[PDB]
Write a protein that binds this ligand. Structure first.
Ligand SMILES: *Cc1c(COP(=O)(O)O)cnc(C)c1O
Ligand SMILES: *Cc1c(COP(=O)(O)O)cnc(C)c1O
Ligand SMILES: *Cc1c(COP(=O)(O)O)cnc(C)c1O
Lengths: 470, 468, 465, 467
């Protein structure tokens, strides 16, 4: 009846479902007294959380503003226009010579859409390899079979970097591009701790009449603050994610050039760009249908908050804390790839000690500390990584400082010593299973318990931003 | 304390533009009239579970082989969601697999395609102009539009124009020549149902797989009023925002176990679709799964197991039948005789007007609706069918008398449409009709109708946020 | 030392190598005293034989006339132009609205070139199936045409034996093909090119015809000419024209259609596409000897001799069919207007193969069939005979009657052999015991019998060889 | 009796224009000079076996699975040709298989590609403007020309311009990033030699196959002067019209035997390329085989087994060395400082004359030659190299004593083209060049040169059917 219907769709989750409520409570309690060092995570603001749970979920609309398939979408069109304006003004771009689109759901759909729109199906692709700081959506083909969709539906030839210097090689890149004849140059970055020469990439792309593509998903806030040079001056298409350093919901953005490309030497006809129409026809209904209106408000609020001086101060503090942490780690006796790191994520190398990344990451996880393992440029033993990638994208937002980061570095050093002790006790010839079994030792259990208790007591002082009342 | 104030600033103090936009949208949705089958309201539990700390967690991978560390809570939540989804449709636990990683229907369909189709092979589905979804396949002569036609070779069949029933002998005789590899069973606008037994028999005779799409009738299958397609099907795709009243996500149901026995050696052939379906989603097409969407889907699915959901579905179908008979009593006939589902395809061929004019005039008087190509239509750029449904109306608390009053309102609206049609002209074009739709008397009439429907619907509450 | 080798270098083949010489002599003696009924073979005159062994086998001139890559190729260009003119005039085709290409080496290369020129990689092609007078199954893939391009064949009505245009219309409207193939190898009835042209114009696709079996019939004027409706027509010059193994491609030229909106006229682009796909697409240097042979063959076929030969072929075919029906033998569909005939023996006890083997063992070459309906994996169920093969020697009505009598005697002997071994016998057991003495001497007589019938007529070809 | 005079009629009585054309071609080839490295005259036995009753026989299938009956005589010739091909290059019978069904090199290569590399695969071959064949792979950013680049993906590698040798150091590094399925070891001229050891090593390390195209040096491989690549490559394709003094045909050599052993299971892995090539050849891109071509290649391989073939090859190498030293003595420079095979590539960049102008001038003075791109050029539009050879001259009877005279004639022609270029202009077009070729100031020179070369070439005989 009417009374039973009210208590069904208008009842809080605290008493309706106690399983999901307890799960969320436990997750919040774990993330409140735990230190996170993942270079691809960050806490969102309360405004984004409130905008995500708005009433926009009960609105299924299709089409772009002006040619909507359904009716009564005036507010949706206004919100989309406001979001596009905020996205175009956040990076200080010209609306007449640039375009933005927030229709894709995440980074993968946006990349697949831009591909299907400009990759020329059954063509050739050229991007950075995966082990030398590259993404999976940038081509991953093996000798036996392919895994990534881009490698299954298209042909891609990745290039490696110098294992000694550590920088991306550019001399052989031009020859490989001239001998391969590609149609799109990808410069994705996943673990690279240095910058890239966009001028040479644009020159190589123009030499063969191809296009240049670069994704700023890993470096999104620094580009808006002014710490990292903006790549909107040499690339044709730019994609990014708003769930890394932008402090927003999971969404995708696509930037393209709109205007004249070249001039005709015969008479002088201006060749207009043919990327906006292709991207629009491929993102919808070429790949997906009805977009997510609940994330538009969140991404708009995030883009608006990123324009304030607080965002710039936060980015400056992030880079300062990153430099301090790198210097502290190098002072203890650890080797860092390329010396330092201009970005926030660093690539720590542990090959000098002889311990792989698997056991180190497992122990660091056991001591209530997050981290991600990766391979080093020129690693012979591909089965056991020797790199422990770190990042501080969310620690600064809680209140971490120089002394706090120094204490965290000391804790990491203690964990490394514990890993070395466990490895020497179990032997080097042993496999990973032996290390996992030896980790449960009485002495090792007491040591990891004391370490986790100390790190929890030290991290419990900093607050946890999020949604109150629970 | 600027950093702490910015990260905790309310929505009303951070940005007022988005707040005012959300308020206006909520008000318009509260006082209005919705008759679209795709539109449906959501509960408050899913809205509260969507926006939480789950967005801060980012860990990609299947339970048991996670790439990151310390994700036992996410694994437990995923296992609970899978168990709930398996126990909802009363499926076999050790013979069916559920996947919730896809973001929506399109990514799930693309994953299933890249997993069990072998690109550039054979594909047979339903035609788009004859009523269907664009993801099922759309290939023309000018240029390809849908990804199914760009990455695969689609070969859809036609439907009967007079009887309106799905033909079978044509596809039966064409499958022996085209040699399809995967059969599609999904329609976006169809009054009748589909015979899954014949489709399964054809798939077994030709040696291929079969997939179904019951998104529109999702809720209808959760109650038990529509024959479950899991009896003679292999792959099933279904969203959670058409009838289930949940967040935007997808559900992929697949069969696991033994397929056939050897004729001589008698060796069982174990299924191998699990590995392919898993590799297609991650790390094949998607990366980090959305934990908030999974939690919302789990809540919306668990809240539909009680008798309340069954009573709601029964009342929905009863009210839909009552509304259909009430509208037909005035003379507006329904194509294909009747409709056993919660959607109706109204046709106004005898009136003379098409579907575009009716949709525009209805949208002008705050009446949600949508057009669609009816069986036997020649004007493809301007169809003549109107898709109507009442899934959200019954969810608000509307009764029989209220629906009768709504029917009277729709009758007055149709009278206004006939008036503007006779005043504009029988030979008027599109632009002329759109510019002449606005009239003094017509403006006053639509204003009075809007005020009346708003005052009548204001007494009914709105689920989700409390008066927000 | 070098002087002694120069003498043997220019020595005849009879003194250089005796093995191949004896092999050629034995093959000639066997084909002279033996008679065949194959429809895919025909004796060639000495003109093409002398032209193939000319000095043109050493010249290497790549490219088309006017765009050659080497120098001193005026004679090659003149010969190619003469061959093109002869081919264009052999079918009364206007040179301003029709083309010709003799670069391909056979029918398969020309067909593949036309396919890659009109159908882009991984395109849609519509053609006739292999069993119903003609290829891709649901298990494996053999034909390269189906490997590089997805093809959807259409079925025909098995009751009346005609192409189902009603179903073909909807099939082409739903599948939306690009190139419709109009060719067959066993279909005795004719084809309606008007319906195919209308379907191609409605769906916006192209039409391709294959007249390799009637290459000569269209030249004489017996069967209708498919050039009035088809766009691209390809054929060979080694089945009916009595020439060498080669191929010819004919394409349309001029204005395709007029657009009232723009006001201009669209011109054909078949010439450029074919020129770019043939060379250097999949072929290198053209065989000048083959061009000279086909040129002299087309020149000799321009006189009334070819027409009277085709008329005599039709008359001999009708006489043979009448003689076969008189002896008590059923003919499938009662013959047709072409030269090939399908003799049915299902009512005698053996559908096919069993009698064909014994016939081949008695100096009587025949061919099987692929008509629908087979108990085993693949049964012929029909004997295909070719009249243009034996008429090239100078046979007449009485000659065909004697051949029919010999065939009847052979069929009776085969029936007796199969009845002596039984019906439950397999193929290997039947082929092993096929050398039974009880009939050996018998067939022996029949053998010399046909021999006495072959030595009386002269065998065409090159003298002294 | 009309059929008697119709079929049994000589070519001279039936046709006249074709007879006159053949006579003119024979007369031009008799008093004309031949220098193309891809042209040669076959023996009289090949021409005699080409035209016979074999052209009237048709049978589709392979020996043992013939679809038509009465083919017992064809199986004998087939096995005889197979045995001759297996014993020509001294190959093991139970270890290698031969195939002579393809018509030419292009269909054979296409069948090998379709049988080894899956459609839309990845292959690596020599680039066309760097000494590679067109059938190996060629494509640009605008469109495609070759069929290999259309139906498959090919990645060509350039050649080192300073050293003049193939940049093998880049192939090993590019194979790990491109992951090819078949390595194409072919070339157009390549005056130098190759090393199949490292190529086979890289091929087995990358898990791919090796297809060597030795059609240009086939005869050399049959003489032992060039290392045979059979003991190092998997598939070997060749022809019989470029060399061996035979007709236009093809020949494929595939490996059949034990590839490798597996210690885990304990069985032995056997080769399977035989079935693949048999299925790709028929029914593949061709239909019925040509018996005349099979008989011609068989008689050619049989005639090449005597000492005459070795003597001819030695004389060809000696003639090539004499021509190279004579051309270098005049003042011309040769690529890589000499040559190893019979063919040579002369460079004229130091002179200042394009390859097209020199080629046209030589062709106008009754001298055969063909231009080609020189290693180090910016493009292939205006080549600067000229490919020369002496197979026909050696087969006719030319000795080393006449090479000095032909070199002097070539030098005179070069001086004439230099004067013409200096008279026409700095950037004169082809129209003005061809117009000035017959100018009053140059008509006497070209006329005297043509008369001299004609009188010098009309002395040696020409092998072939007399009259
Ligand atoms: C971290 C990252 C992502 C994250 O994956 P999503 O599923 O898109 O959230 C995507 N793209 C790039 C380049 C990344 O670095
Ligand atoms: C709505 C729908 C889907 C889901 O499509 P999305 O745009 O991804 O939500 C799938 N199939 C049918 C028939 C649908 O109506
Ligand atoms: C000249 C040549 C051929 C000749 O055969 P085609 O099929 O006509 O190309 C084959 N291969 C190579 C390497 C050649 O130089």
């Amino acid at each position: 009846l009417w009374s039973s219907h009210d208590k069904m769709l208008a009842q809080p989750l605290k008493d309706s479902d106690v399983e999901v409520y307890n799960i969320i409570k436990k997750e919040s309690n774990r993330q409140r007294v735990g230190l996170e060092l993942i270079a691809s995570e960050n806490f969102a603001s309360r405004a984004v959380l409130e905008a995500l749970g708005s009433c926009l979920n009960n609105k299924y609309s299709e089409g772009y503003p002006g040619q909507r398939y359904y009716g009564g979408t005036e507010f949706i069109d206004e919100l989309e226009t406001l979001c596009q304006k905020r996205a175009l003004q956040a990076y200080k771009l010209d609306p007449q010579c640039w375009g933005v689109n927030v229709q894709p759901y995440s980074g993968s759909p946006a990349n697949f859409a831009v591909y299907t729109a400009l990759v020329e199906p059954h063509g050739r692709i050229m991007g950075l390899d995966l082990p030398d700081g590259g993404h999976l959506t940038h081509g991953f083909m093996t000798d036996k079979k392919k895994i990534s969709a881009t490698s299954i539906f298209f042909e891609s030839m990745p290039y490696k970097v110098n294992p000694d210097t550590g920088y991306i090689n550019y001399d052989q890149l031009e020859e490989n591009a001239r001998l391969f004849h590609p149609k799109l140059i990808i410069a994705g970055t996943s673990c690279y701790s240095r910058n890239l020469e966009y001028a040479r990439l644009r020159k190589i792309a123009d030499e063969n009449g191809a296009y240049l593509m670069a994704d700023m998903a890993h470096i999104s806030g620094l580009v808006a603050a002014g710490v990292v040079p903006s790549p909107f001056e040499h690339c044709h298409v730019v994609t990014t994610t708003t769930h890394k350093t932008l402090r927003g919901c999971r969404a995708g953005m696509i930037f393209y050039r709109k205007g004249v490309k070249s001039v005709d030497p015969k008479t002088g006809k201006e060749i207009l760009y043919n990327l906006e129409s292709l991207i629009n026809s491929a993102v919808f209904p070429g790949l997906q249908g009805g977009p997510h209106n609940h994330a538009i408000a969140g991404v708009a609020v995030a883009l608006k908050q990123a324009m304030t001086l607080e965002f710039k101060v936060y980015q400056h503090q992030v880079v300062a804390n990153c430099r301090a942490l790198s210097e502290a780690l190098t002072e203890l006796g650890y080797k860092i790839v390329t010396g330092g790191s201009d970005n926030h994520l660093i690539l720590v190398d542990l090959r000098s000690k002889g311990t792989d990344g698997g056991r180190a990451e497992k122990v660091l996880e056991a001591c209530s500390i997050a981290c991600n393992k990766n391979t080093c440029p020129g690693d012979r033993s591909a089965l056991r990584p020797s790199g422990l990638r770190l990042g501080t994208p969310a620690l600064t937002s809680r209140g971490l400082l120089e002394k706090d980061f120094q204490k965290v570095a000391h804790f990491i050093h203690r964990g490394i010593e514990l890993t070395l002790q466990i490895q020497s006790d179990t032997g080097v010839r042993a496999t990973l299973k032996e290390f996992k079994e030896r980790l449960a030792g009485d002495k090792y259990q007491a040591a990891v318990q004391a370490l986790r208790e100390e790190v929890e007591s030290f991290a419990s002082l900093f607050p946890l931003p999020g949604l109150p009342d629970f």
